[PDB]
């Protein structure tokens, strides 16, 4: 029974553990709607100012 | 081709020496006026396009030529005046007249409603400075304040109107583009849309109501009787009425019906007051209300005949009323008070000027066809198709137009001038030149004014 550590624990890993799989959605219900699509391609001047003049 | 010679007239006055000034400003503007008559007179089937919209084209604008014709004529009249003032202020002043003519070239050429409006209001600032400085009479500030009180309170409603139309239907910009025009369905929201577009040009085109803008600007004159020709250009500066009524609202003209009626008493009651008044300039100022009221009657009918008469009257009034102000200038430079009763007697001192008095006064009446008869007669013939009763109202005006001219003549034909020791010298060479350069273009337009009254003619 006699075993004393003179350093500590320092985060021990449990490789033998199986039990249940980790990814199973812990809190998330909705995936959230897809964001605005990113515009790919270089912009070209067509109208050259859509203001009152020029 | 009309951009950057008037802008090149700007450094001309500053660079030239103190001995010259007036010799350069006039000679380098007369050759510029020659080029306007050389190039702008050409027309195809419809309206052309000279360039991309910075300054556009001409559709029914020989009125541009008139401003180019007055480009040296204002410098002719202000010669005895501003002769005793500072040389640096002479250079400052001519540039302000040039800047007025600069924006006036822009407004007639540009076929926009947005670019036109901001340069239509860009003529207001130079005139304000020209009126409020060098004014010979006291309380000239009332002539300055009411100049921007009556106009801007009516014209700033264009910003809420014009931008509203282009937000709904395409864009106003190119005008020849604007044939996407939907007929106005006559709704209560469209009531103020029509009114805001009109009220801006109900001030500069003087009615019976809101007409006090004009005589105060003439009685408290900018310069004696010299810079009044610019205020004559502001009267014909309300030519946007020709474009707004035609393009923006052709269907709904039920609201035009009370405005013709308001200007119908702006013919008789504006001519009645112009009979007893003491100021000689005011006797031209109130007569200029009635002759410009003719256009407001004409345009709102919208018949093809009225447009022929109106466009003629815009050019007719621009050379006849301005000529009358030059006669008022010649009397004021000698007596130094514009009282009609005091300044009495021609031919005894002024023999040659008396014939020029006739060729300027009788043009208010319908003479052998100059441009005034051609202007008036088409409008009267247009009002009959509108309603038969109009000529009863219009006929009274024809009587008081004789009470304009002859009353100006008789009060100067009475040979006395007992109290007057001045007016010893008859006339200068430039003095009689003003009488010729105003009347001889009217005399040349007797022959063929085809290139004057031209909205598809």
UniProtKB/Swiss-Prot annotation, chain A:
Residues 18-44 are annotated as: Disordered. Residues 31-44 have a biased composition (Basic and acidic residues). It is found in: Mitochondrion inner membrane; Mitochondrion intermembrane space; Mitochondrion. Complex I is composed of 45 different subunits. Belongs to the complex I NDUFA8 subunit family. Contains four C-X9-C motifs that are predicted to form a helix-coil-helix structure, permitting the formation of intramolecular disulfide bonds. Accessory subunit of the mitochondrial membrane respiratory chain NADH dehydrogenase (Complex I), that is believed not to be involved in catalysis. Complex I functions in the transfer of electrons from NADH to the respiratory chain. The immediate electron acceptor for the enzyme is believed to be ubiquinone. This is NADH dehydrogenase [ubiquinone] 1 alpha subcomplex subunit 8. It comes from Bos taurus.
Curated annotation (Swiss-Prot), chain B:
Keywords: Electron transport, Formylation, Membrane, Mitochondrion, Mitochondrion inner membrane, NAD, Respiratory chain, Translocase, Transmembrane, Transmembrane helix, Transport, Ubiquinone. The keyword Nucleotidyltransferase does not apply. The chain crosses the membrane at residues 20-40, 58-78, 92-110, 114-136, 145-165, 194-214, 222-242, 254-274, 282-301, 306-328, 349-369, 391-411, 433-453. The keyword Magnesium does not apply. One of its GO terms (molecular function) is NADH dehydrogenase (ubiquinone) activity. GO terms for cellular component: mitochondrial inner membrane; respiratory chain complex I. PANTHER family: NADH-UBIQUINONE OXIDOREDUCTASE CHAIN 4 (PTHR43507:SF20). Belongs to the complex I subunit 4 family. Core subunit of the mitochondrial membrane respiratory chain NADH dehydrogenase (Complex I) which catalyzes electron transfer from NADH through the respiratory chain, using ubiquinone as an electron acceptor. Essential for the catalytic activity and assembly of complex I. This is NADH-ubiquinone oxidoreductase chain 4.
